[PDB]
Structures are given as structure tokens and as C-alpha cells.
Design an enzyme around this catalytic site. Sequence first.
Site, mmCIF file in Angstrom:
data_model
loop_
_atom_site.group_PDB
_atom_site.id
_atom_site.type_symbol
_atom_site.label_atom_id
_atom_site.label_comp_id
_atom_site.label_asym_id
_atom_site.label_seq_id
_atom_site.Cartn_x
_atom_site.Cartn_y
_atom_site.Cartn_z
ATOM 1 N N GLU A 34 0.984 -1.129 -0.059
ATOM 2 C CA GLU A 34 -0.056 0.009 0.173
ATOM 3 C C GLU A 34 1.118 1.112 -0.169
ATOM 4 O O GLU A 34 2.146 0.994 0.376
ATOM 5 C CB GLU A 34 -1.038 -0.020 1.091
ATOM 6 N N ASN A 81 -10.772 -4.789 3.454
ATOM 7 C CA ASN A 81 -9.209 -4.825 4.535
ATOM 8 C C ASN A 81 -9.686 -4.867 6.042
ATOM 9 O O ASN A 81 -10.294 -3.958 6.437
ATOM 10 C CB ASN A 81 -8.344 -3.563 4.071
ATOM 11 N N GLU A 82 -9.238 -5.931 6.723
ATOM 12 C CA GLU A 82 -9.135 -6.132 8.029
ATOM 13 C C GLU A 82 -10.450 -5.806 8.543
ATOM 14 O O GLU A 82 -10.682 -4.824 9.472
ATOM 15 C CB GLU A 82 -8.239 -4.981 8.742
#
Length: 627
Positions: free
Chosen positions: A23, A350-351
Site C-alpha cells: 500500500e 481490508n481488516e
Amino acid sequence: VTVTVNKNPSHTVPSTLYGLMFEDINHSGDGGLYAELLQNRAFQQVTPNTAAALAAWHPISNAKLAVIQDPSPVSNALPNSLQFSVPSGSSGRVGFTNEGFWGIKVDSTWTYKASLFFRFPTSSSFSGALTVGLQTNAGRVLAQNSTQIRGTTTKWTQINLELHPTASAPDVSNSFFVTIDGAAGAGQTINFAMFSLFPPTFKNRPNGLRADIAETLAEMGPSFFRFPGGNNLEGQTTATRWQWNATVGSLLDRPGRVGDWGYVNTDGLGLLEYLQFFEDTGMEPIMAVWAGYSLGGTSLAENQLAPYIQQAIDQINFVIGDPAKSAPAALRASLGHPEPFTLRFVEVGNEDFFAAGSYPYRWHDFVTALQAQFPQIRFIATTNAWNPVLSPVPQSYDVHVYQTPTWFYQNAFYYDGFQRNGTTYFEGEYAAISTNANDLFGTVADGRLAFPTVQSATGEAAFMTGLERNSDIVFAASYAPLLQHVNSTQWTPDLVSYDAGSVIKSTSFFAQKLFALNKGDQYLPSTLPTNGGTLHWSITRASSSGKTFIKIANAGSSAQSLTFQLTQFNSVSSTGTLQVLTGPETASNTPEAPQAIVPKTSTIGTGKTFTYNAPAFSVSVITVTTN
Ligand SMILES: *[C@@H]1O[C@H](CO)[C@@H](O[C@@H]2O[C@H](CO)[C@@H](O[C@@H]3O[C@H](CO[C@H]4O[C@H](CO)[C@@H](O)[C@H](O)[C@@H]4O)[C@@H](O)[C@H](O)[C@@H]3O)[C@H](O)[C@H]2NC(C)=O)[C@H](O)[C@H]1NC(C)=O
Ligand SMILES: *[C@@H]1O[C@H](CO)[C@@H](O[C@@H]2O[C@H](CO)[C@@H](O)[C@H](O)[C@H]2NC(C)=O)[C@H](O)[C@H]1NC(C)=O
Ligand SMILES: *[C@@H]1O[C@H](CO)[C@@H](O[C@@H]2O[C@H](CO)[C@@H](O)[C@H](O)[C@H]2NC(C)=O)[C@H](O)[C@H]1NC(C)=O
Ligand SMILES: *[C@@H]1O[C@H](CO)[C@@H](O[C@@H]2O[C@H](CO)[C@@H](O)[C@H](O)[C@H]2NC(C)=O)[C@H](O)[C@H]1NC(C)=O
Ligand SMILES: [Cl-]
């Protein structure tokens, strides 16, 4: 310890076992892998008439600078311009500089490509040269080039000039400049937009990547690249999430976005630049799609998801769709890449373990739609495995862990107890980050690692032997973060560090490289390590050659002897190669000592039974040929 190595494999090692996680964090994209040299190049997502809007830009002489919301902007996506004014009563060079991302490497063997757009907002009598160049920060010109402009140019006009420094700078404390003659320019105002300065790029790609960083990533032999996040996918709010379609096409048409690490992203490193890098390196993507959650805490309601599901379909169609069948696929073809790219794996969010109350319906609605459109793709869930229970049943989960070096060797049996029930596991982020179990995400003073250490890399390697043993269900694993600009860091430790001019390969980098470059397609079961102990190993074999890779992590403070028993093989080579990464427990590679800890290669005596003394705090690879 006596280690028996079976000749009959237990399973096939996945091609995807080791790869990278990216990222834009620590200026890994803008300022990092993406080769652009100017910071704040297009005044994206800044507030006009503030000092913050002028970040990285500085006057030369009595120049007056302001960022404005231009009444006639260069494009819809780029509403801000730099207003440059020269006072009446002027003479001598006048203009402005850009400091880069904490410097600019100026190399006499490199050609640079400079560009900008300008116009005179009020028609004027100006007639003279516009000079662009590179200078030391003390003001010595290193390279320049010029073109004639006229104050009657009231329409946006692009200038494109190369720069050819004859001598390298002595350090990276250099700036890009734009000047006019202040006498010719006295009393003049010029608006500028969409600046750019590129060095030569990896594989000479247009709008491409910084070669020393790109080459360092390729050196670790990765099989996949997870992108674009990570937290940087999610945004702080729905409106500031990553959006694929804002990252493709002309740079004039990319608005940029506020990312999740305190800085604006240009989106110059966009979806097509990622995909081209994968083609150039042989990596396959693990591509994330936004899934209805952002980091400020808001989950979209179930009855709000449809447009965002469609956007995820569009994203995938850009990568793999037939150009005749969708607008995104037609756009990939119009940008010069009509063939589809490879894409086997998509991550949903994400997460989402941070938003596990809403993930069941977000997962259900996204994957129901996406699996119907793309039956061949494997969708990866991001909540903690099996809690909450998801529908449809995930074929894969992404598991993240940041912990102490000691946790990593103590948890090398993490996957051994899992049922084998058709679900595979991606260790999509892991690192040993701190020696302080009571504050993992703290300061360096309180035990956070500034850079990976021998201790951290050896603990990680121990855990990695477990990933390799359990690679019947673990299909992929990546350290995080990958990259760090040492002058603008939001997270440590990182796998690869750099400044404007040079790269630092960490201890952890070398552990990743040793594991990934010495990996067979057959997993050979062996005597198990002690669960909780400091000494771990994993053995694989290349089915075509018989090359046999014995990987050993000694994550503790004492040397340990191993006796390998290979008597099930008909033949074992009488010598092997030995590659060892070791040093003092707390040693690191740093900007000041970038090669303190590097692997050493030698030969060792081997046979059907042979010994090896694994040093304290070491990663070793012994390669023999077996048949
Ligand atoms: C495929 O195999 C998977 C791996 O073996 C199976 O995963 C297990 O799934 C069950 C649910 O079916 C999970 O059990 C739940 O456990 C929670 C409580 O958990 C936590 O604390 C324990 C200590 O007791 C710890 O081990 C965890 O890490 C947690 O801290 C209960 O509250 C629920 O009602 C339920 O029992 C297992 O947690 C889970 N195991 C693992 C290792 O993830 C999976 O079910 C199989 N899938 C299919 C489709 O068959
Ligand atoms: C100033 O910039 C121009 C434009 O980039 C350079 O001219 C190019 O030079 C290259 C390499 O010699 C040629 O392949 C191109 O055809 C030229 N383009 C144009 C439009 O002329 C020029 O070399 C630069 N001059 C200096 C002093 O750096
Ligand atoms: C990228 O595409 C999305 C759609 O997938 C665009 O967002 C839509 O924008 C319109 C017009 O402002 C809104 O009325 C819709 O509600 C938006 N939809 C979503 C899902 O956000 C977005 O504007 C595009 N980005 C760029 C730069 O063109
Ligand atoms: C960017 O970071 C580098 C690496 O930390 C800085 O260079 C160091 O600066 C310190 C303090 O002056 C010196 O003690 C080190 O010897 C320097 N290291 C190296 C390897 O040169 C650099 O000053 C930073 N750049 C900016 C613009 O802040
Ligand atoms: Cl520790």
C-alpha cells in the site's frame, strides 16, 4: 536434534507461497516505487491560499507564490494552480523550486523528463525564456533547458523539456526549479499546473517506477503482489476510499485522494501501472476491492451497497474483461493493453475484523454478485477466520499478525491444528515489530524496532517454516510493510528502506529472499520441531532437478546442532551449498551501515547423514541434490 527427512512428499508447495504486500505508506508509492521526483506536483486535495497547499514549493528571489482555485483550471480533476507573481522593479533570476521527496538524485548518466502546464491569466506583453532545471539546494545549477513563451498565451499550454546534467550532484540535497528573467518578468503573473519530473524508469515504462526499488523487489523472487491495501484501500470515509477509475488515463484526469497515512496520493501509481509492473516481474496480483467500510468507523447499510458492488465488478473487468463486453475492459484496450491480465485472487475489503458486525452482509452481498460474474476468481475474506461465520463459505481468509520476535518462534505451529476442509490461508501481513509485549505499536524508546533486526528476521523465519510445513492450506504469505522512505515514516519496521538516492535491504528482506529463492514444489515431511522452541526447519525439493532446500531458523541465543538423516534417498550429494544470515541479536541494516548484515555463501560436507551447527540468531539454507 536428529531430523529424519522423508523421501515421499506430503504435498505440493504452492507457486504463490511467498510474495509482497503493498500500500502507499511511508511514501512507498508517491516518493517511492512511483518514479515521479516532484512532491505535491499538481496541488491535489490541498486548500487554496494556505501554506500547506505550497508544501515542497519555495520561492527564488522575490517571487510571490499562492495556490489558487483557478477560475479556468487545467482540467476538471485538477482545480488548483500555482499563481507565480514577479514584483515590479525586479531583475535577476526569479521563480520557484520543488524540494522533491526530501531530495532528488541528480546523476550525469540519467536523462530527466520535465513538464508543466502554464497560462497567463491576464494577457501580457511578456516575451522571454522559461527555464526549468535542477540545482543544488545552495543554488548551483546542475542542469537546465528553456523554451520561449509569450504573455499573450492565455490558454493552457504544456512545456516538455529534457534535462541532461553533465556532473552528478555530491548528495541528494537538490531541487527542481522554474525561472524567468526578473527584469523581463517584472510585474508579471503566470499560472502553472500539473508539473512532473521523471528520471529513467524501470523497463523504460511511461509513467513508470523507480528502478533501484523495482529491481530490489524482483530480487526477492516474489510470486504475488497484494495491492492497493491495506488501510490505504479503505479511506477515512466512503468519499475518500480508493477508487480504480480515478487512477487510470491521463494524469490530467486523476484527481488524487487523501490517503490513510497523513498525505495526499497523486494516484499516478494507478491500476494500469500496477498491472504492467506485475507483467514486467512475473508476479500475479492479489487485488483488493473496497467492501463498504472505511476507517472512521462507518459501514454502509445493506441497502446502500449496490453501486459499490458494481464499482468492484468494473475494477475486475478493467483487469480481465473482454474489451467488446464492458466499458472498463474497452478502456484497458484503449490504454494500449487489449490482452487481459492474470487475476486469480480478489480480497474483499481490508481488516474487516474491525467491522465484523457488518461484514457478514457486506461479504455476502459482494461475493454473491462477484462470484456470479467471475466464477474462476477465489475471493478472500478479511474477518478473523470463522468468527463471525460467513455465507458463502470463504474459500480463503487473510490472516494478519504483528507481534514480538519471540511470539513468532513460539507460534510456528499456528496452522498445524487447523482442519483441512477446502479453505486456504493468506498470511497477508506479518512482521516482528517490537521487543515489548506490553506495547507492540509503541515508540522506539519503548521497544518498537526502527529497522528489522537479526532477532526479528530469525523469529519470522521460524514462523515461516511453519507456513511452509502447512502450505497444503497456507497458499501465500507477505511481510508488511514492504517499503519505507526514511525521511517520511509512519510505520516501522519495514522490509526495504530508501532515501532519494539509495536502498537499504533489511535483515527481514534477506530472510524473505532466502525462503522464496530456495523453495521446491515438493514438501518433504520431517521430524517436527519442538512446539514453542527456538529451533525450526522446513525441507522442500524440486521435482525436476532433485535440488533439496533445508531451511533452518535458530531464533534463540545458543547455537544448536542438527543431524539430518536422508537415508530414505538412494543418493545425496557429498557437498551442499550453505547460505547463512546471522549476526548480533539487535544488529540491523541502517542508512549509516546498509550492509552490516548480509548472507554468506559457502560449501559444506553432506551425505545420507550429516551434521550442521546452526549459530545463535541465524537463518540457514543448505542445498543438496537428492534422488
Ligand atoms: C474448517 O476448519 C477450520 C479450522 O479447523 C474450522 O474453524 C473453526 O471453526 C469453529 C466454528 O465452526 C470455531 O469455533 C468457534 O469458536 C468460538 C470461540 O473461540 C476462541 O477462543 C478459542 C479458545 O477456546 C481460540 O482457539 C480462538 O482463536 C478464539 O480465541 C465459539 O465461541 C463458537 O460458537 C465456535 O465454537 C473455531 O474457532 C475455528 N478454528 C480456528 C482455528 O479458526 C472451520 O469451522 C472449518 N470450516 C468448515 C466449513 O468446516
Ligand atoms: C531540451 O529539451 C528538448 C525537448 O525534450 C530536447 O530535445 C530533444 O532531444 C532529444 C535527445 O537529443 C531528441 O531525441 C528529441 O527529438 C528532442 N525533442 C525536441 C522537441 O527537440 C533537448 O535536447 C534539451 N536540451 C538540453 C540542453 O537539455
Ligand atoms: C469513479 O466511478 C464512480 C462510480 O463507480 C464515480 O462515482 C459516482 O459518481 C457519481 C457522479 O458524481 C455519483 O452520483 C455516484 O453516486 C458515484 N458512485 C459511487 C459508487 O461513488 C466516480 O465519480 C468516478 N471517479 C472519477 C474521478 O471519475
Ligand atoms: C533523510 O534521512 C537521512 C538518513 O537518516 C538523513 O541523513 C542522515 O542525517 C543525520 C543527521 O544529520 C546524520 O547523522 C547521518 O549520518 C545521515 N545519514 C546518512 C546515511 O547520510 C538525511 O539528513 C535526511 N534528509 C532530510 C532532508 O531530512
Ligand atoms: Cl521478543
